[PDB]
Amino acid sequence: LGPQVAEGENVFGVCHIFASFNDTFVHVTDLSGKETICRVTGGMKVKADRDESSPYAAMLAAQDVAQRCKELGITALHIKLRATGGNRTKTPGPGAQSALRALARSGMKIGRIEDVTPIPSDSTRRKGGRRGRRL
Amino acid sequence: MRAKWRKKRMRRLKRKRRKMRQ
C-alpha cells in the first residue's frame, strides 16, 4: 500500500543477495529482515538450469525486485551479499555483481554494502572426499 | 601391477587357503 511518507525521503529495505554457483537469490526484506517485500530468483527467470546462476538471470531478477519494491514504496536498499558459505565456497556466484548492477540501474538507492556469508570458526567435514572432486 | 593390489590378491589367496585348511 505504501508508507505514509512520500519517496522524497528515503525508505530503506535490506536486499539479501545469495549468489551461489547454481542460482541467485535477490530477497528484499524489512530492515529487521523478518518481513519480506519480494524475493525473486534467477531460476524463476530462465527455463534452463544451466543459466539459473547466469549474470543475465540475476540482472533480470534484480530488475523485477527493484520494480516491485518501488511499487511498494522502498527507494533505498541495504545490501547483504552472501555466498554459499559453511564448508563450501566463500566467493559469491557469477550473478552477484550483475544483480547489484541491475539493482542500482533500476532507479534504486544503494545504502550500506555488507558481506554475510557464513564463515565457521571451524566446520563439519566438507562434502568431497579426502581426494576431493576428480572431474 | 600395483604392488598393494598384488598384496591384496595374496591376502585373499591366504584367506581362501585358510578356508581350505580348517
Binding site: 500500500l1 508508507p3 530492515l31 555488507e114 564463515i119 | -
Partner: protein
C-alpha cells in the same frame, strides 16, 4: 485479487536516547486480525543499524543490534540488544605477522543486564622495527588477555546499560585496553569485537520510556 501488502501497516522504529538519530527506519507488519495482534508480531525484532546511521560522527564499521521492546502509536521503541563489527573491518584487521589476542567476559550491569563482551587486539610493529614479525610470547598474551578481561569487567559491572552503551559508542573500553597494554606489548587494533545479550531483566515500560528520552 489477494494482495498481502494491502493488509500491512508501516511503523516507525525509534532508537534509545543514547544515539543522535532516533528514526532508524520503517517496518511493516500485517494488521491485527483476531488474536494475531500486530504488536506481538512486531515485538522482538532485531535491527542491525550501523553506528554511522545512528550517530552523526561515528565509525560505520560498528553495528548495533536494537530490539523492539514495545510499540505505541505506530512507533516501535527499540532497546540495546547487541554490538558487532562489520566483516570487512575484522577481516582487514587480521594480518599475518602479528598475534591476535582475544578475550571475553560474561558480566552483568547494575540493572540486571547480563552481557557477553568480546575484545580483540593485535600486537603492534614498532616504527623502527626491522624484524618481520611482532609476536608476543604466551605469557605476554595471557597478561594482555587478563588486562582486557579486568578492564572490560570494570567498565561494565560498575555502570548500567545506558552508560555501557554510551561508552561503547566511541569504544572507550578499547582505547583503555590499548593504553593499559603498552607496558606488556604495544597493541594495534583494540576493539570490543562483539557484545551480545545473554540475559535481560524483567521488562519494565518505565525504564524503556526513560531510555527513550
Amino acid at each position: 485479487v489477494v494482495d498481502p501488502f494491502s493488509k500491512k501497516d508501516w511503523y516507525d522504529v525509534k532508537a534509545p536516547a543514547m544515539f543522535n538519530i532516533r528514526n532508524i527506519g520503517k517496518t511493516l507488519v500485517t494488521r491485527t486480525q483476531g488474536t494475531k495482534i500486530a504488536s506481538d508480531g512486531l515485538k522482538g525484532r532485531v535491527f542491525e543499524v550501523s553506528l554511522a546511521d545512528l550517530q552523526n560522527d561515528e565509525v560505520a564499521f560498528r553495528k548495533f543490534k536494537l530490539i523492539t521492546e514495545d510499540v505505541q502509536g505506530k512507533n516501535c521503541l527499540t532497546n540495546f540488544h547487541g554490538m558487532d563489527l562489520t566483516r570487512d573491518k575484522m577481516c582487514s584487521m587480521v594480518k599475518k605477522w602479528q598475534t591476535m589476542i582475544e578475550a571475553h567476559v560474561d558480566v552483568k550491569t547494575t540493572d540486571g543486564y547480563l552481557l557477553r563482551l568480546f575484545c580483540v587486539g593485535f600486537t603492534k610493529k614498532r616504527n623502527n622495527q626491522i624484524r618481520k614479525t611482532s609476536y608476543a610470547q604466551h605469557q605476554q598474551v595471557r597478561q594482555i588477555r587478563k588486562k582486557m578481561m579486568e578492564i572490560m569487567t570494570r567498565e561494565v559491572q560498575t555502570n548500567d546499560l545506558k552508560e555501557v552503551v554510551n561508552k561503547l559508542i566511541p569504544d572507550s573500553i578499547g582505547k583503555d585496553i590499548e593504553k593499559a597494554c603498552q607496558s606488556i606489548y604495544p597493541l594495534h587494533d583494540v576493539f570490543v569485537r562483539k557484545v551480545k545479550m545473554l540475559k535481560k531483566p524483567k521488562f519494565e515500560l518505565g525504564k524503556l520510556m526513560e531510555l527513550h528520552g
